[PDB]
Amino acid sequence: AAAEHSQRELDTVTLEDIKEHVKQLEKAVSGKEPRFVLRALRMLPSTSRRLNHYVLYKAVQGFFTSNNATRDFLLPFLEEPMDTEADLQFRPRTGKAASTPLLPEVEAYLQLLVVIFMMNSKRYKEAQKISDDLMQKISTQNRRALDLVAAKCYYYHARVYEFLDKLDVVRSFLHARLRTATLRHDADGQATLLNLLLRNYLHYSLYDQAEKLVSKSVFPEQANNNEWARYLYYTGRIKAIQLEYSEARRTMTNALRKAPQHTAVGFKQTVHKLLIVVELLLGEIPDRLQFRQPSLKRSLMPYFLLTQAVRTGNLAKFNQVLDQFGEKFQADGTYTLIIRLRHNVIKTGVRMISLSYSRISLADIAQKLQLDSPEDAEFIVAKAIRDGVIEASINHEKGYVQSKEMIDIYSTREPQLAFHQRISFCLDIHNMSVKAMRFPPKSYNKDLESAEERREREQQDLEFAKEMAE
Amino acid sequence: GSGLRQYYLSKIEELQLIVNDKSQNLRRLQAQRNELNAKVRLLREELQLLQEQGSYVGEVVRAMDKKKVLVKVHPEGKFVVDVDKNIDINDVTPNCRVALRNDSYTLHKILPNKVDPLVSLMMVEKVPDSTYEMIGG
Amino acid sequence: DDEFEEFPAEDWAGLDEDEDAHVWEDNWDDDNVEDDFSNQLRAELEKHGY
Amino acid sequence: ENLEEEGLPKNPDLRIAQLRFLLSLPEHRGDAAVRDELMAAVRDNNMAPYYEALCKSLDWQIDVDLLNKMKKANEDELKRLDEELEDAEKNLGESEIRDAMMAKAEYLCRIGDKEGALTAFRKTYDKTVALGHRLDIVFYLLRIGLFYMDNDLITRNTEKAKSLIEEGGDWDRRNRLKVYQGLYCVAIRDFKQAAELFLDTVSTFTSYELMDYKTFVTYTVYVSMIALERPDLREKVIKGAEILEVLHSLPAVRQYLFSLYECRYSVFFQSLAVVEQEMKKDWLFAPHYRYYVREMRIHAYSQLLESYRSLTLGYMAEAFGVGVEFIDQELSRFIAAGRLHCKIDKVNEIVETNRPDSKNWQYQETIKKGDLLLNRVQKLSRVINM
Amino acid sequence: VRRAAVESLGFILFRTPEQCPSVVSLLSESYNPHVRYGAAMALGICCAGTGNKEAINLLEPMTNDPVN
Amino acid sequence: DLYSRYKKLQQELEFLEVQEEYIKDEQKNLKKEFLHAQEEVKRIQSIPLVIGQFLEAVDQNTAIVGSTTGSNYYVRILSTIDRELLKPNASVALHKHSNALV
């Protein structure tokens, strides 16, 4: 019974952990500070795996101490232990505490713990029933610190339907809850629902729907970093499809910054994959360092070969990646943006041709870009000249392209513009850092002269005048 | 069976968020004001403080009873001085540096200890430091 | 912390044997796929009949 | 005749790391000659922890009889050193206790127990009174760092070694550290610093535990051609008496060095290909063999075009003993990369040189290197807030 | 004028005596002794007869002020 | 009592705005007086000043100085003195009365 002894030893400490978190939730209302709820949800992923059938049963039938319809709801959905030798009655509530109903804060929290276990137990149909039941409890309530708990409940309530593969019935509930959260100025709740809605729309390729939502809804500025990161990614993916690459790159780069530093590897891979394409779509260059990371090396390898093909500006090399990694891009949700890279491959290849050749024949351009015929390269280079891609001219009669003499870039306003976007950002950090400095509320004006010691000079200086002068 | 009870609660909770935000912001600013106010207040009091006579520097010969200490003021020979109520007599060790008040010569601070006489003696002798690695044969 | 379990974490399957473990000013030109310069020169010395 | 005896102890043997690196290459994995030499070093020094790592990474068959025989020697020798340490700590003096751990740290380093050696050396360093003995322990850790390419170990110990040389003005140890620093600079593609450090110790080289003098001069020439300007190369390398004496016994290296200086571009390209294969098989230059040869080709192309307003593609091809198309592809690739200040007129096959000011090149790096700084500042503020 | 400006706060807030020991508490520690004096008088005028403990807690250190 | 709570909260918000505006006004004027306090403390440096020798810094605001009169004093240091210039064996001007490092 070595496994039983170790498991029961791990079961009781987790029960104590749940007791501590609920105490914080109860004390959050007592102190009227909703931020105390966060430290209970801070350890929520830690407690998510640290519970089993026995752990749930002890908590749910011991925390409530009142056999209401709630206890008629969640006990039947979990297994019960036998007559164990160590019958430690886990009853945190005694006397008036046991008789009094549980706060709406904690009954949602314990119910969420049951919902999470149903997720880990693959009882998605059963999880939906409890999650649906939990959805009525927090909808009727209008508490303020419950908004912090409710946001986590909404996140998992979309998760049960994610495994149920419906994702459509929850859209009505998310929109209705979002308006409820927005009208109540639910900063944390509004941020989570907006992210969940964007995931809902992006799952069914409703990119038009999500663009409209982000165009009107205002994301909470005082939102969590983990919730901001999803919004930046979802908006960045939205901008990428709408050919708004410049604003997409800013958000995706921002999403990586606000991502967790040690966990959420899968999120990092997804954002890295999309940022590489957007960076290639914008004509810029992906950072070589991101392909070196141990976690990203295997995932970004198809995109690493894609970036190499785009770099050379060769159509044949770009197409070879397509016929080889086409299915991986499709299964990755980025196949559409890779197709648009064919125009970019032409763009970069023309750019080096103009940057390396003062006068190049059109047939040579077609060979270097692996186009079909020089006449097709004629229009391709012509559009590059009108678009500002390359400063050059075409001699149709002679059949070559003459690149313009490169102008001294330091004698232009371009260095000032590049510095301005760099100078103003440096000044922004200083202002942000200074505003982030906190002075603790120490007892000011106490480092001054003490009342007793300041009196010491007056008595002594009185004798100084009363004796030296006489 | 409520009237504008929901309307009132919406109004009250609306003001609470602004009040809590402004109250937190005000406490930030009050500490900023207090820190600057303390700097100004300490600066004006410093001018009066700097006019207070400086303390003598003496060397403790030995401690005596009733919190008496025999010291040697640098140019002015030996004295028997009191000990300030904030200074423990047990920390007054022989050959220690102490600060004495201007008029009462009261021992009011134990200054950092001077150079040890042996260290001072070995500084002028200046025997070159050596290890076994720099000895050959 | 609220880790991103929502996004499918693709399996690592990476090489934990210090694949690169280097700190340089690395650039993309080293990653261009091409044969060694010795092969390139050797493939051209006989192209002129030498 | 006593050159090799002057060097520091050969622990860890950097030849073993080079032998291990050759087996990592697919080309030389099955070379029995390299395998026999590595196994001879392993068997002689009873490197049991290295045997496990060698067979684990390279997927070899562990000789149970050989491993057990070597492991018994390691246990017996560790027991002997422990008894000596126990004997010294109770009766003998502190210097004898220090020597007991130094033997234990040395043996763990010899048998490849990197983790044990680092702990043992740190214990020995803590109660080692002599400054030079402390610095030798640092040089031991630097050699251990180079053996496994532990950048944290090398950088940390290099700073410690520099501080120790400052306190005690040991110019002999200062010259050795430059060789150690230059070897790391080679490993991290810092040829500009490698050339400077190597050239300062080309006449004071006694670090035979790392390399032979001919190999040191060979690397010194190599890093000089990529990191030194033409006037600096002539004064230090071409007219260097110490290098010229060694180059008498290395005709290939002298041919490689003088071909570029004497503008024998066809000769230089042939020598560059030879240097490539040598650099590919070198554990220090292997990560940078593509970079160095690409940079060397850029140097040769720029040097030929530096003194001429315009050169035909055929003349460039004839000078380098290559075809016109090869020069076309190479020049176009390097001009697009911004490394060659010229433009190609393919219609007439003329390469016209440019003179861009240093202000443009200084501006781009400030944009480039400044941007790298901003991300660290941007990311550091991110860590600060949460 | 500064001393009278703080003093006039007592006449405006005597109907809400608890409000004075919050607005004038920081002025009770100001560098200017005249503002500090008015800070004392503002509490006295506004909290007259009420025995406000918060106001009295402000005046207690002020009775040891360096300025007479 | 709902309306009383709503109006009491309303006056609290308006009072907080008044407090935050005066605290911003005072910080503006407290900076002026800091400069005046810095300017007016320089009268401690008025000549004549006895010349001492800086010996040891006990803490930030106090130090041991050797006056040319032949006596060692434990005195205070003016806060507007560049502590980077307080090198060992540095000649320092002391207040003729209080021997303070000015």
UniProtKB/Swiss-Prot annotation, chain B:
The UniProt GO MF terms for this protein read: ATP binding; ATP hydrolysis activity; DNA-binding transcription factor binding; general transcription initiation factor binding; proteasome-activating activity; TBP-class protein binding; thyrotropin-releasing hormone receptor binding; transcription factor binding
**What's in the keyword line of the UniProt record?**
Acetylation, ATP-binding, Cytoplasm, Nucleotide-binding, Nucleus, Phosphoprotein, Proteasome
A single BP term in Gene Ontology: regulation of transcription by RNA polymerase II
Q: Which GO terms describe its cellular component?
A: blood microparticle; cytoplasm; cytoplasmic vesicle; cytosol; cytosolic proteasome complex; extracellular exosome; inclusion body; membrane
User: Which residues does the record list as Phosphoserine (modified residue)?
Assistant: S104
Q: Organism's domain of life? A: Eukaryota
| The protein's role, per its UniProt record | Component of the 26S proteasome, a multiprotein complex involved in the ATP-dependent degradation of ubiquitinated proteins. This complex plays a key role in the maintenance of protein homeostasis by removing misfolded or damaged proteins, which could impair cellular functions, and by removing proteins whose functions are no longer required. Therefore, the proteasome participates in numerous cellular processes, including cell cycle progression, apoptosis, or DNA damage repair.
The family this protein is said to belong to:
Belongs to the AAA ATPase family.
Name this protein carries in UniProt = 26S proteasome regulatory subunit 8
Q: Which organism is it from?
A: Homo sapiens
From Swiss-Prot, chain C:
Query: What role is this protein assigned?
Result: Component of the 26S proteasome, a multiprotein complex involved in the ATP-dependent degradation of ubiquitinated proteins. This complex plays a key role in the maintenance of protein homeostasis by removing misfolded or damaged proteins, which could impair cellular functions, and by removing proteins whose functions are no longer required. Therefore, the proteasome participates in numerous cellular processes, including cell cycle progression, apoptosis, or DNA damage repair.
Annotated membrane-spanning segments are none
Q: Which domain of life is it from?
A: Eukaryota
Protein's GO biological process: double-strand break repair via homologous recombination; mRNA export from nucleus; proteasome assembly; proteasome-mediated ubiquitin-dependent protein catabolic process
Coiled-coil portions: none
What name does UniProt use for this protein? 26S proteasome complex subunit SEM1
Q: Say which family it is in.
A: Belongs to the DSS1/SEM1 family.
* Keywords attached to this entry: Nucleus, Proteasome
Q: Main localisation, per the record?
A: nucleus
Gene source species: Homo sapiens (Human)
Gene name, Swiss-Prot/TrEMBL: SEM1
Where can this protein be found? Nucleus
Q: In which tissues is it expressed?
A: Expressed in limb bud, craniofacial primordia and skin.
Q: Which residues of the full protein are shown?
A: 16 to 65 of 70
Listed GO CC annotations:
cytosol; integrator complex; nucleoplasm; proteasome complex; proteasome regulatory particle, lid subcomplex; protein-containing complex
UniProtKB/Swiss-Prot annotation, chain D:
Could you list this entry's UniProt keywords, alphabetically sorted: Proteasome
Biological processes, Gene Ontology terms: proteasome-mediated ubiquitin-dependent protein catabolic process
Q: Does the keyword Aminoacyl-tRNA synthetase apply?
A: no
Boundaries of every PCI domain copy: 190-358
> What quaternary arrangement does the UniProt entry report?
Component of the 19S proteasome regulatory particle complex. The 26S proteasome consists of a 20S core particle (CP) and two 19S regulatory subunits (RP). The regulatory particle is made of a lid composed of 9 subunits including PSMD6, a base containing 6 ATPases and few additional components.
PANTHER family, alphabetized: 26S PROTEASOME NON-ATPASE REGULATORY SUBUNIT 6 (PTHR14145:SF1), 26S PROTESOME SUBUNIT 6 (PTHR14145)
Q: Which InterPro entries match?
A: PCI_dom (IPR000717), Rpn7/CSN1 (IPR019585), Rpn7_N (IPR045135), RPN7_PSMD6_C (IPR049549), TPR-like_helical_dom_sf (IPR011990), WH_DNA-bd_sf (IPR036390)
Which family is this protein grouped under? Belongs to the proteasome subunit S10 family.
Record protein name field: 26S proteasome non-ATPase regulatory subunit 6
* Purpose: Component of the 26S proteasome, a multiprotein complex involved in the ATP-dependent degradation of ubiquitinated proteins. This complex plays a key role in the maintenance of protein homeostasis by removing misfolded or damaged proteins, which could impair cellular functions, and by removing proteins whose functions are no longer required. Therefore, the proteasome participates in numerous cellular processes, including cell cycle progression, apoptosis, or DNA damage repair.
Cystine pairs: none
Note the superkingdom of the native organism. Eukaryota
Swiss-Prot record, chain F:
**tRNA-binding found in the keyword field:** no
The UniProt transmembrane annotation reads: none
UniProt keywords, alphabetically: Acetylation, ATP-binding, Cytoplasm, Nucleotide-binding, Nucleus, Phosphoprotein, Proteasome
Q: Which GO terms describe its molecular function?
A: ATP binding; ATP hydrolysis activity; proteasome-activating activity
Q: Does the keyword Nucleus apply?
A: yes
Gene Ontology biological process terms in this record = blastocyst development; proteasome-mediated ubiquitin-dependent protein catabolic process; proteolysis
For this UniProt entry, what's an example GO CC term? Answer: proteasome regulatory particle, base subcomplex
Cellular compartments annotated: Cytoplasm; Nucleus
Self-association state and partner proteins as the record states: Component of the 19S proteasome regulatory particle complex. The 26S proteasome consists of a 20S core particle (CP) and two 19S regulatory subunits (RP). The regulatory particle is made of a lid composed of 9 subunits, a base containing 6 ATPases including PSMC4 and few additional components. Interacts with NR1I3. Interacts with PAAF1. Interacts with TRIM5. Interacts with ZFAND1.
Say what the protein does: Component of the 26S proteasome, a multiprotein complex involved in the ATP-dependent degradation of ubiquitinated proteins. This complex plays a key role in the maintenance of protein homeostasis by removing misfolded or damaged proteins, which could impair cellular functions, and by removing proteins whose functions are no longer required. Therefore, the proteasome participates in numerous cellular processes, including cell cycle progression, apoptosis, or DNA damage repair.
Family note: Belongs to the AAA ATPase family.
Q: Which gene encodes it?
A: PSMC4
